[PDB]
Amino acid sequence: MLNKRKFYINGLWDDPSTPHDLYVIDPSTEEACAVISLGSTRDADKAINAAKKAFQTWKTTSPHERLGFVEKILEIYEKRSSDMAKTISMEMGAPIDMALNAQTATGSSHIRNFIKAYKEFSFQEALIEGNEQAILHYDAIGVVGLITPWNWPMNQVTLKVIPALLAGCTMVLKPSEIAPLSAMLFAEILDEAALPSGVFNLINGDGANVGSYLSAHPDLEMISFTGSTRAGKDISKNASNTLKRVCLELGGKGANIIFADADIDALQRGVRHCFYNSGQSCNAPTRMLVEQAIYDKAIKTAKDIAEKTQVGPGHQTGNHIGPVVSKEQYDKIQDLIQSGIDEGATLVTGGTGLPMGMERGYYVRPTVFADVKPHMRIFREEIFGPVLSLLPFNTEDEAVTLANDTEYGLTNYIQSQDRSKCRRIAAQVRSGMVEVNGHELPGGSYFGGVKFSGRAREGGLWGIKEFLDTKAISYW
């Protein structure tokens, strides 16, 4: 079992003020793989003090020198990529192939996209096009709090730490206490990159104590948070007394609108996307809304793909899905699956319990429901397991109404070979992102939602600017 009790504060790994041990569980086995410390408010004060002190000199480094640190971080990140993949796989259950090619690789892709964006960005520019007197200046917002979850850990950590570096901020990161090891290795990457003492600090801890304490701390000027909508509301409440900037990346209940004229592979692509990372993706397309004409075909295709979707441990190679991350997550998912049965949805395949043959680990069966109705829990609540809900629609208006019947609005999805129809529907759905016909958003695009999904705009230029204040100077 790994001894990982220390925090990274002011350039050094140090003990917490008081021991408060927590085992990190490997969800593929149910066994402890490491021990960490849950920090107290004193450990937070230490980290924040180190960051405030560093900021005074870090804010005066040139963009050139900051970019050089980020390039160095990328170089060491790539060198440690398979250590990172194994760590992620172990702590949160990602099957090892996808732990390397998606969990770890998205980190490197975000880093590169920040680099490209930074090269196009200037800290001064015209305030009004064609006025050569007044100027717009961007300033480091200050010392910031960063809070990341367990589901796509390096995706979420790189999206926050890199633009904060480039902006000239210093920071305290609290990663997820159920998957902190990847962040601790990221800490080692930054230390090996010789990032100046106090610029980056890592303390472990929980939401109710350390997370809330950071969000209310008077020496932080911003909190960047990725996590559940429930937690985001409390972050926002705690931050309001010091008028911090609050940037939130929260949950989703994505609709995938599939028309009869969708390309051949639309249905398969959709079902596969739902189960990817065992459904533990805030933007996963979990409500499949299918035109009446191909509804029976959709059910049949979802059934086939589900039955062919293997489940297996994180440590095994291949394209099975892994366990879900925790017992508590497993229990919530089982309850929601049972609710689908009890509320009268059609159970197409899968259901409650461990898949046949698995004796231990938080393995959830790939599950499909059909004839799901808007009032059902499985329609409304984010499940975060490999659980798809299908229902039909008859008109474009009905599809849009169903897609918009949610408080969330992260990514919605549309499949149709009719470009005009794609455009009409894309304009009417209420989300921060829309993926049409399996096309991903380009590198350097933002990632973020509207309404209960949060309104953060992470990635590329958007992401760098969340860590800057603007200043309008009337004569430069």
Active site residue ranges: 249, 282
**Residue 469 near a copy of itself by CB under 8 A:** yes
Which of 9, 25, 162, 266 touches Na ion (CB under 5 A)? 25
108 binds, among Na ion, a copy of itself, none (CB under 5 to 8 A by kind): none
H or E stretch at 378: helix 377-380
* Residue 49 contacts a copy of itself per CB under 8 A: no
Which phi and psi (to 5°) does residue 35 adopt?
-120, 135
Give the binding range for Na ion (CB under 5 A) out of 80-88, 157-165, 173-181, 266-274.
Answer: 173-181
E strands in 182-326: 200-202, 222-226, 245-249, 255-258, 287-291
> Strand, helix or coil at 149?
coil
| Residue 132 near which of Na ion, a copy of itself, none (CB within 5-8 Å, type-dependent) | none
Selected binder of Na ion within 94, 178, 181, 434 (CB under 5 A): 178
Could you say whether residue 137 binds a copy of itself (CB under 8 A)? yes
Strand-strand pairing, 468-473 and 135-140: antiparallel
Residue 249 binds to Na ion (criterion: CB under 5 A): no
Compute the distance between CA of residue 435 and CA of residue 415 in angstroms, rounded to an integer.
9
Instruction: Please state, in angstroms and rounded to a whole number, the distance separating the CA atoms of residues 357 and 337.
Output: 20
Q: At closest approach, how far in Å is the CB of 337 from a copy of itself?
A: 28
Q: Where is 174: in which H helix or E strand?
A: strand 170-174
For Na ion, give the closer residue by CB, 153 or 449. Answer: 153
Classify residue 161 by its DSSP letter. H
Tell me 451's DSSP state: G
| Interface mask toward a copy of itself for 369-408; x: CB under 8 A | ----------------------------------------
| In contact, 175 and 153? CB cutoff 8 Å | yes
Q: Which long-range contacts (CB under 8 A, 24 or more apart) does 53-59 make?
A: 53/198, 54/10, 54/170, 54/196, 54/197, 54/198, 54/199, 55/140, 55/142, 55/143, 55/169, 55/170, 55/198, 57/196, 58/168, 58/169, 58/170, 58/196, 58/198, 58/199, 59/140, 59/168, 59/169
Q: Which of 115, 127, 347, 358 binds a copy of itself (CB under 8 A)?
A: 127
Q: Tell me the residue ranges of DSSP E strands in 283-424.
A: 287-291, 346-349, 367-370, 387-393, 411-415
User: Is 62 near a copy of itself (CB under 8 A)?
Assistant: no
CB–CB of 209/183 below 8 Å? no
Beta-sheet pairing, 143-147 with 21-26: unpaired
Choose which of 333, 433, 456, 464 interacts with a copy of itself (CB under 8 A): 433
By the rule CB under 8 A, 224 interacts with a copy of itself: no
Q: CB nearer to a copy of itself: give 341 or 450.
A: 450
Which of 48, 173, 250, 388 lies at the binding interface for a copy of itself (CB under 8 A)?
250
Binding mask 5-24 for Na ion (x = CB under 5 A): -------------------x
Taking the least distance from each CB to Na ion, the nearer of 178 and 220 is 178
Q: Does 232 bind a copy of itself (CB under 8 A)?
A: yes
Site for Na ion in 72-111 (CB under 5 A): 91
Residue of the chain from 18, 56, 240, 338 that contacts a copy of itself (CB under 8 A):
240
Residue 431 CB, nearest approach to a copy of itself (Å): 7
472 forms part of the interface with a copy of itself (CB under 8 A): yes
- Binding of residue 184 to Na ion (CB under 5 A): no
Query: Tokens standing for 335?
Result: 């309850």
457 binds, among a copy of itself, Na ion, none (CB under 5 to 8 A by kind): a copy of itself
The candidate with the shortest Cα–Cα distance to 279, out of 251, 248, 317, 318, is 251
237 binds a copy of itself (CB under 8 A): yes
**Tokens of residue 133, six digits:** 């007197």
Q: What is the rounded distance in angstroms from the CA atom of residue 96 to the CA atom of residue 166?
A: 31
List interacting residues with a copy of itself (CB under 8 A): 127-128, 131, 133-134, 137, 139, 221, 229, 232-234, 236-237, 239-241, 243, 245, 248, 250, 422-423, 426-427, 430-437, 439-442, 444-446, 450-452, 454-455, 457, 469-476
List interacting residues with Na ion (CB under 5 A): 24-25, 91, 178
